[PDB]
Amino acid sequence: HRFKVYNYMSPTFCDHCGSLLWGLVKQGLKCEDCGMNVHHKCREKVANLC
Amino acid sequence: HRFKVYNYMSPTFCDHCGSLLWGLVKQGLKCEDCGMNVHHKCREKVANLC
Numbered sequence A, B: 001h002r003f004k005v006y007n008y009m010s011p012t013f014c015d016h017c018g019s020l021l022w023g024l025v026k027q028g029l030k031c032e033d034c035g036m037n038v039h040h041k042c043r044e045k046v047a048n049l050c
């Protein structure tokens, strides 16, 4: 994965843990290649396989 | 048009005046129906026709 920080325009959940990516901006990280969305706290817990 | 404020993820120009929508977040307004992108200062100068 190549996670880049993303500003989400709709309530989006974290593809790793299932809770909402809270906030107005900078809510999480979106992988540039496959679109997985994760909380900053969950990026490290995701397998690299993309 | 139904302009809603948008957080752009790439350098985007204003479809009304041609200058860059400056900033990291809240750079401009995107029309929800046809995707036109405008600076907050240009929203009022755009014809309504969407």
Ligand SMILES: [Zn+2]
Binding pocket: A001, A002, A031, A032, A033, A034, A035, A036, A049, A050
């Ligand atoms: Zn990925």
Ligand SMILES: [Zn+2]
Binding pocket: A014, A016, A017, A018, A019, A038, A039, A041, A042
């Ligand atoms: Zn999470």
Ligand SMILES: [Zn+2]
Binding pocket: B001, B002, B031, B032, B033, B034, B035, B036, B049, B050
């Ligand atoms: Zn429009």
Ligand SMILES: [Zn+2]
Binding pocket: B014, B016, B017, B018, B019, B038, B039, B041, B042
């Ligand atoms: Zn403009």
